[PDB]
Amino acid sequence: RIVPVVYYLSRNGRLDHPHFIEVPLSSHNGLYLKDVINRLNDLRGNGMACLYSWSSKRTYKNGFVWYALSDEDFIFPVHGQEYVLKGSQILD
């Protein structure tokens, strides 16, 4: 199965529209960050996703919070099986 993922890249402060990709699932009850990163590696090259620290949008108080993810972490959806991530440019 494949799931829809929207991601926002943030450099100075997200000077750009989000991207939409379809991500192949490794397990049928859940998406892991590694699944997203594998798909980006295929589309954008191995050198892209490692430039960013990844978060997923999650409900918090009266809005949302960007919840920091590791490669091995499970990603929870927001709203209706909707997956929204943010890659924040690593500054080193």
Author numbering: 18 to 109
Quote the study's own text.
We recently discovered Arabidopsis SOSEKI proteins, which exhibit polar localization throughout development. Polar localization of SOSEKI proteins involves two conserved domains: a central domain required for membrane association that dictates localization to polar edges, and an N-terminal domain required for focused localization at these edges (Yoshida et al., 2019). Concentration-dependent polymerization via a bona fide DIX domain allows these to recruit ANGUSTIFOLIA to polar sites, similar to the polymerization-dependent recruitment of signaling effectors by Dishevelled.
Note that no structure of a wild-type (WT) Dishevelled DIX has been determined as yet, although multiple structures of domains bearing polymerization-blocking point mutations have been solved. We thus used the structure of the human Dishevelled-2 (DVL2) DIX domain (Madrzak et al., 2015), to design a set of point mutations in the AtSOK4 domain that are predicted to attenuate its polymerization (see below). We thus solved the structure of this domain at 1.7 Å resolution, following labeling with selenomethionine to determine phasing. Like DVL2 DIX, the AtSOK4 domain adopts a ubiquitin-like fold, with four β-strands and one α-helix. Strikingly, its α-backbone almost perfectly superimposes on that of DVL2 DIX, with a root-mean-square deviation (RMSD) of 1.74 Å. This was rather unexpected, given the limited primary sequence conservation between the two domains (19/93 residues). Like other DIX domains, AtSOK4 DIX forms a helical filament in the crystal, via head-to-tail interactions of individual monomers. The interface between individual monomers exhibits considerable hydrophobicity, and close hydrophobic interactions (e.g., W83-F81, W83-H34, W83-H36, Y84-F37) are likely to be crucial for the DIX-DIX interaction, although hydrogen bonds (e.g., D85-H36) are also likely to contribute (recall that D85 was mutated for structure determination). Nearly all these residues are fully conserved, or even invariant, among land plant DIX domains, suggesting that they are critical in mediating polymerization. By determining the crystal structure of AtSOK4 DIX, we established that this domain is the closest known relative of the DVL2 DIX domain.
